[PDB]
Symmetry: D2
Subunit: 384 residues, 4 copies
Amino acid sequence: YQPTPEDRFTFGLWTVGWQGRDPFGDATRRALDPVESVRRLAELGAHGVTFHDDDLIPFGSSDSEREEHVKRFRQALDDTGMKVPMATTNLFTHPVFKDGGFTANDRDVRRYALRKTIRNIDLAVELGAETYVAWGGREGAESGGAKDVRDALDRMKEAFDLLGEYVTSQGYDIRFAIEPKPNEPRGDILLPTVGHALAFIERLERPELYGVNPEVGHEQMAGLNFPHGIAQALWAGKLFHIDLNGQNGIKYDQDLRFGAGDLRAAFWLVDLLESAGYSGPRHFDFKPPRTEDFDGVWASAAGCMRNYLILKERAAAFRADPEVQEALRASRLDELARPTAADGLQALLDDRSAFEEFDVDAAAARGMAFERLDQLAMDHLLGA
Amino acid sequence: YQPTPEDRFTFGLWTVGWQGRDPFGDATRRALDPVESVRRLAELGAHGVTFHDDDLIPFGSSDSEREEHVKRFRQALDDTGMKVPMATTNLFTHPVFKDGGFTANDRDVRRYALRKTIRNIDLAVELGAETYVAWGGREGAESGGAKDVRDALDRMKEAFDLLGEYVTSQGYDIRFAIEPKPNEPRGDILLPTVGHALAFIERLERPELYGVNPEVGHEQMAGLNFPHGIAQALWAGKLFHIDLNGQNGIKYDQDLRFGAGDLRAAFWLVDLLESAGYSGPRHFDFKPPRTEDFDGVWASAAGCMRNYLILKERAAAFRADPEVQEALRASRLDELARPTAADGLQALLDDRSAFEEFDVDAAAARGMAFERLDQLAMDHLLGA
Amino acid sequence: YQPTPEDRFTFGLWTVGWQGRDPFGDATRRALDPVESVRRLAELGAHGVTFHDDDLIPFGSSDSEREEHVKRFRQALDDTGMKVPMATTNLFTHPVFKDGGFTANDRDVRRYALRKTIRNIDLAVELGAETYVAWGGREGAESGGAKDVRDALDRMKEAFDLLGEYVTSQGYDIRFAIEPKPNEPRGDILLPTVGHALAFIERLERPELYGVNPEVGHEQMAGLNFPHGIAQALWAGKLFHIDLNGQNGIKYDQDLRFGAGDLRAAFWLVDLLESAGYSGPRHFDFKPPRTEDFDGVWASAAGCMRNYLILKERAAAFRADPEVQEALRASRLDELARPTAADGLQALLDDRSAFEEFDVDAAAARGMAFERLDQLAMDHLLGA
Amino acid sequence: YQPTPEDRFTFGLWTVGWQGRDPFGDATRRALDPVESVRRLAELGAHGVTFHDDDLIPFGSSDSEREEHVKRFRQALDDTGMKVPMATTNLFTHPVFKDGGFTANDRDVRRYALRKTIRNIDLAVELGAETYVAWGGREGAESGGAKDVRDALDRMKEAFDLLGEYVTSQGYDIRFAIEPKPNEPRGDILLPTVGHALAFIERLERPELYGVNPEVGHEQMAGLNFPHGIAQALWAGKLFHIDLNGQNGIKYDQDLRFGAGDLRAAFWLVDLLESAGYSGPRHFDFKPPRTEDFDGVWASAAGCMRNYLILKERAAAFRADPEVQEALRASRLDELARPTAADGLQALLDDRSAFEEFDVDAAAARGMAFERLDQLAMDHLLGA
Ligand SMILES: [Mg+2]
Ligand SMILES: [Mg+2]
Ligand SMILES: [Mg+2]
Ligand SMILES: [Mg+2]
Ligand SMILES: [Mg+2]
Ligand SMILES: [Mg+2]
Ligand SMILES: [Mg+2]
Ligand SMILES: [Mg+2]
């Protein structure tokens, strides 16, 4: 279980470098240097990093302070063989975003929110990122009257339209991925589930430009099955990226290491990507708990990497045992892949074995046999 | 607060006629006669009824028992002046649906599930219903391996495709409305929120044929703001129907009377339909609690009707007070309706007042003034 | 609805003075002066203030800086006629409390946590507070192995034992009130509900010294009926204090103004204190949302005060209408106050009308008539 | 992983014999014979059974039909070597309990509720049960006005007082265990958590007579850590029984097999009983999902038994590795067992190393090292 760069594991600068400041208390570690965060991840076995625009360059820095920061960061990229596959904008930390960016009430703020996104699109294309993740963390409200949603759904689309026009005119070969979250920091946020995000995308002037970035924890916060959100996304060709962490149920976004929270969910999820052929970057968006020092930090992401490598093993072993392969056929998982009525509407309607001569009592007695399967994946997951 | 038939209030046969049998205990009232449920609602002030196909005719009845039941029910419709605007299929109560209908694993069941839907489409068109609500109550799973979702999203669409072909060929002038629910009876169900349902619809061969039937309680079960789900639906032209009840948070579907559960949510919701021009049937899908007798029953739906008539009054009064109308302008609710960049991408990008000469500290200090508004709707809602 | 000081309304220095810094973003208002927070509340109609020990005096201040701060604050108390009925310790903001105070793993921290509590007990007795609220905000864990609970329940009791010994020896005439919260900032916290807190209290060497400080929002976070927690407390003589705010369900502690969140819950709660004779300080522990300026601030607490004064009116009107008073008797609310078996075990057991000659079908048909009552309190709450 | 009768595993007649009837649909299996449920469990390796009083004898049976049923059941007990360690009363299924038993409003019902409990106490003492579990499933309300809680807390205690007097006078050597649940079937139920139940117990005239029966699923429904509820119970000497199943979060009581739902919670729980010396009956209160036939049934409880036997192995292996034993000492789990101030209040207060000469910055930098531990139990749980 030593991760290789060919696993394409990415981490974020913000995730290992989180200083442990929480809504109630102060930061228990000092600020890292992005140079030192790059070298270190290449000595654990990771494959790339990802950053918001305030990560790499501090807010308000002068254009010569900007490039020096970019030159250092680049030199590190050239000193580790590590890439930057995804990049993103910080639209949430400055008090001028307190009511959002793209959906902020005030008109003058929305324009600035757009200009600060485009300026980081040019940086991420230069550092070669193939994905561009957008999380409206401040879009939504705390009170039913504060945000008229239909207008707020009108200004979102606008800005994401403009983002699609900026990239077409420039010749940039990059795609957007919206990241949803139902609440926190806002009491409600717009486009809450992965499903809501798919709905909004189909209404943009160029639907082939935008996917979704889902997160394990963000969907489990609404009590929602994640490997089930991850199938709908693959089913409409819209899994562009995915965020790997752990979460213990409906509550504040804990952002635990991947492996924690719900382990059977992390199992069935790794099963689904490997067997459906997801070739994107396994990104960990998480938070090493604030109790730990720096030694607890680097042990934490080694976990992320090491837990995925174990389930992928138990996932493949589950799918290679000919006792499971029979167990699948006894629940009739194969008929679920065959068409219901390939013979056509008229044949169906003419078929008397489907209604008038159908034995509803002999069908209803057939046992689905789901509980001996679920234990064979229980056996395969615990290795007993 | 006497409801008039011009309010278009509908109830369901199943809702007043619920016998009070719960997952743990037995039925505390005896079965009603659909004739007696029709006369009675016309003496409270309601405008129509709605039914599943097992409501009006018992399951398995012979075709002469079917028409006699239809003839009685019709004679009542002719003896009250009441209509049937929406109708729906019972795909959940018989044990042959234990794993669903349209998404049931077995192939022979899915065909039957389709045939039992079409046969009730012909009844509802004869009784003149304009809407046809579909609630996959048994679609979903309890275990991560039991339902491959991408296949299950393939067989849904199929059947809803076939339903759209059956209605086009026949000349029927009716539309479908999917009704979502995140769980119960199944531990998870497919297409959980109103947003998921909008996503699935755009992928059917005829997108102008299907809307959503939302329910207050079904979305509040996932901790989701309902007057916010009700705006996204209006914003894509897909509010075909709506179900009115009450619910106290994330838990088993209580199905309380409209007015209970969350009253401010019921306030902001009635505000939104009246000010956006919803002309559909105000349907109450609810359950008079099983403790009550028949006298408690008829008092219960009188509540439903009487609580909507009060909020519509407090909603209009809130929107007519020129102190509110000023209060809206002080939060800048008017600029939220104006475009962000009608002058065009190039102008925005050339405008130095939007970035380089923008005063971020003087904007961030402007107070949104949300809390004096929210009390004026507090004042308007309690009438003090 | 002008609040009078005889309403005994208290606010906290920390609540109006919250600077709007959240887990994701920066503070949108500047720091208040406790002098200016005192004068202002006396011009709205409030009756007292309450403070943590880091509020009034900054952490680490020298003993001459301490008394000057106390002298200023006192002079204000003498310049408004306002009292300080409750006081409390800040055990959560400094990084030396990251794992708790009384339950912190390390031994040297626990002693310091005790010394910093006693030193503020002497201040609050000097400023005359009658209650001393204790919220272990940092007690609990994020991981099943980090905190052995039985030991952690052993060190709590210890420190609360020592607190009871310090006050008995000194002659102080003050009582403690534990404040529970199920999670946040910690993912789980110890003694989560009001019920857990009552359980822990009975095990201290002096049970007549400790009550509970409950909070509306803290119990609604676990999906729990608050006017029902507020009855169990009164029923064992342990409602020493209560915190008034609002909360929209299970999620991060919003701390909305009293009146928001759940209004029917705030109704039935004000009903319960007024009709049971609670004579304690109506304290508002809340957070004016960070979008507002200072003008939005002072409007916010005026709400708190003004919403309580409205429900107390609708609560009394509900309890004075002889149609309600009959409505209570028809549900048999009076027999619920009579004893089940005052005649004694032997009589009960000899009574053949209670078993062998009991008509179970004629009892089960009697209607509890709950839904016509609930609308009369609906009518009384909306005033229609 | 073959369970032996010396594991003391009990099942309930009602759990394997659940017919699969749910709040929305009909029963997918036929009724078992309690004789056939007894023989079968003795061929899987279980140690006893448990029953409600309507299980073994149908409601209303004549006293000769009662004893014949008891004689058959007994003959089976004599034909398997299996015991009946716990028994319980069905106070929830008949419509005369729709508003509760002990807390039912009506006076005549409460007396009957008491008489039907005592009559089953005499049966369970004859069949030799050592525990007597009581679940007020119908105690609570759906509406804030329907149940005055303080009175309702007065009639509970009464009946549980009377139950304690009936057993003292008779010479019965048996103890009660209250079983809590926050909601369902009622929207709220009284004494919701394990903590609330401990609080109610200390107020009965004979506190050494009543413990708590906790259930994994019942506490996880309120989002509450179960191995943490299971420590508070052991810490006050009040773990008399425990119910083993699985549950996926806050929602309707799924009652999955032990092993499902939250596996790390089931891990840390088996860890806690084995290392604290719980000698009671490992009872499975669960529901084989209704999709299965009878073959899926018996595979299901074999799981329950087989999953506990695996964690007890991984739990012991985790606690025997001297790399863990060092890992415990590095988080300072040993100082958490030492007293904070065994030297006494006066010494603490005189100790200048605990306040005035205390290095708060060198303590706050010490890393708790929680994340390398949690992975060693991750390694020990997955066996990698
Ligand atoms: Mg995150
Ligand atoms: Mg994320
Ligand atoms: Mg319903
Ligand atoms: Mg509905
Ligand atoms: Mg608070
Ligand atoms: Mg508080
Ligand atoms: Mg159960
Ligand atoms: Mg149970």
